[PDB]
Amino acid sequence: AADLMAYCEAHAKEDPLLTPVPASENPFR
Amino acid sequence: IDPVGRIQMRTRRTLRGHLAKIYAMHWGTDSRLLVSASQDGKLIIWDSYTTNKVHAIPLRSSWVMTCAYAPSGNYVACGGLDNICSIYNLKVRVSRELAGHTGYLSCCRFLDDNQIVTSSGDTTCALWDIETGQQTTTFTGHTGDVMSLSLAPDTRLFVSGACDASAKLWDVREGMCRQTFTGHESDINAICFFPNGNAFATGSDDATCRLFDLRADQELMTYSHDNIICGITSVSFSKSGRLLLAGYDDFNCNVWDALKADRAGVLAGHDNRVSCLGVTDDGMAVATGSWDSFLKIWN
Amino acid sequence: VNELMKTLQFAVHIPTFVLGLLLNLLAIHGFSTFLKNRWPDYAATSIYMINLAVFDLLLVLSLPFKMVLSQVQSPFPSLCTLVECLYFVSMYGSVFTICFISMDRFLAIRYPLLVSHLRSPRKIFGICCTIWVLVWTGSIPIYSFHGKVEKYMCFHNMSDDTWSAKVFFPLEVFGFLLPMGIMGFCCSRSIHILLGRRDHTQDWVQQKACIYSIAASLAVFVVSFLPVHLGFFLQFLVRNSFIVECRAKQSISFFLQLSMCFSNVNCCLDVFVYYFVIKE
Amino acid sequence: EDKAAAERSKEIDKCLSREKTYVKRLVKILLLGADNSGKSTFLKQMRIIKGIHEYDFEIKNVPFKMVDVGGQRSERKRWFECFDSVTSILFLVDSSDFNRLTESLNDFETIVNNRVFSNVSIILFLNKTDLLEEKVQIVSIKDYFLEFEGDPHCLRDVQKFLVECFRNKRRDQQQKPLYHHFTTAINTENARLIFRDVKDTILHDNLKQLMLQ
Ligand SMILES: Cc1c(C(=O)NN2CCCCC2)nn(-c2ccc(Cl)cc2Cl)c1-c1ccc(I)cc1
């Protein structure tokens, strides 16, 4: 529950789906 | 919490060559190489970035329902209605026509270069040693056919779904089942762990997704809308954990919020039922396969 | 008879024109909806259904240019030539589309295996394109109808340069007698082959509406295209000094005028016998 | 560089494109029944060639693939019926054993009502008619079925009764054809019959593509 929310908060930075990246760091673009 | 609302989730590639329905795919650990096979008896390893057929492996059994790609990228696994799990050495000939099951195979996922966990129609999940040639342990306790299997992201435990609206968390080391979970109405079509390893999500033909944990050992929450009626063919996850995915029979892949309990996106672009769905090990981009024979790589 | 001429032609054309326009536009709509949705079973058939509907819509278009420009004097040889070429093209395009559809059905039924592989919608599109090409290529001799008049009452005073043997004989055999022969052989064999399937399954009570629709299609094609071309033959004989009677020739001319205004409504009869024996 | 490997990819397609002219010309035929039906004598009668078995043969340059479910048929959930692409379901039934005919009919009724097989034709076979032609007189067909109307000593009355019993099991009769036949255990030219019924199934498919109705 709360642990899942903390994991979401801490690891959101490496989520190319939650935060799509421009072609700078996007091999699929 | 802070909702993510909607995600503009766009395709980035489309992969062609399969002559029938795709039944399953697998994302490698390097995210670059993908493996998927069809029900025409063909495995193909794809270059996911460049859309290049790295390998096209024929099969003896054209009735094939699971595929695997080793975490070391060395081997692949292939199981189907002929009950024999073929381990293929990419470096492609059969490494081991490794047998021992009675029912048709439904899900096989390597633990290392040597151990493989298989689910079948025999209702028992069997952990096999390729070098020995025979099983090294067998988990029982289910009633229906174990169609779904998902490994923990520590190579220590695993989950199995078995057509009886229930899932078994079992321990690889202890060779026995550790916990059981209920909450559905129909078959467990696919199951996957939360990438941290203390929770998992289930999809069932009752058009309802669910999310449980091994910590509280209870049904944490559920996902369902009245306008959705098709069965969840496959699920996956994103590293953050604010999202989960669900392939559907209703021609589309619905991507839902894993916490806020609402739909956050829909991937169309499939001409048939969605059968395969995976997320790369670095979280870059989703891939889905459908009965079109068309794998496409969303992002 | 001339007042009767105009009254009959107008009272036939106006409902024919409106009905043909509406029905053929609706047919194009429906089969476009079927085709663009990437439907693979209903593609290689919607292609020639669209081609038929388009030829029929074009023949609908040339109707008011006979309902307001028939006897009205008009210093426009180019417009009258365009209208007459449109009329010939659309009518004989409907003719040849029907003939090709019937060959399609007999080839699918007599040979069920082959047409199941050699069934490219692109192949049907190639056949339709060849249909348009041949129709418009054959519609070149309609240019040589000028004669010696400038003020034209359209659909009249058609020149004897296009009444000789070399323009009539390759127009009856290759415009009616060959479509009649092909439509007859294909439709009869398709009926006799869907009938021979009583030696086996329930298709003897399942693929029965197909026989009714194929028979209806043969009947409509023949009854819209048998009398008018024999009237065409009668007028050719009038043009070859074979019939000299004045009252009889006037009656024959009225018969040909009425036969063509009855043959055009095939553009409304090809939209009922087809496009209503379908699901929608 | 990397793109040079795409040449190999093209080479791979130069093989897969070959399968394009086969997996489309290929006819799939399930082969079902029970133990007593006599599947083995059937297959051995035409000189044809773990879990499910497969056989490959050719009739008049057409490739047929008989997918013999070797006793795995008893499964009753969707995922195992990965056979919806199969052209036809060929049944065998031991006509003689009237006791087993109820179970055979129950198999028929629970196989044809698979919505998976809503677009599949059936080729039912009633095997061993000699052991029925020489047993209909001795054993009364009406002694087992309470709705038989014809003459229990007449062979053809019983034959038509059985056919109608099997054809009466289909809900939604209007979906696809149902052939049948009364062939003995010899099955001397049975491949011709299979070919004829497959050809008629393809004819029905054509009429479905021609949209004549
Ligand atoms: C009338 C008539 C004639 C004709 O022969 N007229 N002569 C009558 C007696 C001697 C002097 C004039 N030709 N067409 C005709 C027209 C279009 C094509 Cl595509 C082909 C043809 Cl043959 C029509 C005719 C007129 C109106 C209709 I509505 C249909 C046919």
Author numbering:
A (entry chain G): 34 to 62
B (entry chain B): 37 to 127, 133 to 340
C (entry chain R): 15 to 294
D (entry chain A): 8 to 56, 67 to 230
Sentences from the paper on this structure:
Despite the lasting debate over whether GPR55 is a cannabinoid receptor, it is known to play crucial roles in the nervous and metabolic systems. We solved the structures of LPI (16:0)- and AM251-bound GPR55 in complex with G13 by single particle analysis of cryo-electron microscopy (cryo-EM) at resolutions of 2.85 Å and 3.19 Å, respectively.
The LPI-bound GPR55/G13 complex shows a better density map than the AM251-bound GPR55/G13 complex, which may be due to the higher affinity of LPI than the weak agonist AM251. The receptor side is well resolved except the N-terminus (1–9 aa) and C-terminus (297–319 aa), due to high flexibility of these regions. The receptor structures of LPI-bound GPR55 and AM251-bound GPR55 are nearly identical with a root mean square deviation (RMSD) of 0.473 Å, showing only minor changes in the extracellular loop 2 (ECL2). In contrast, AM251 occupies only the upper portion of the ligand-binding pocket, surrounded by hydrophobic residues such as W1775.34, M172ECL2, F169ECL2, Y1013.32, M2747.39, and L2707.35 within the core of the pocket. The binding of AM251 to the receptor is primarily mediated by hydrophobic interactions. The aminopiperidine group of AM251 makes close contact with ECL2, in a similar way as the inositol group of LPI does. Additionally, F169ECL2 forms a π–π interaction with the iodophenyl group of AM251, stabilizing GPR55 in its active conformation.
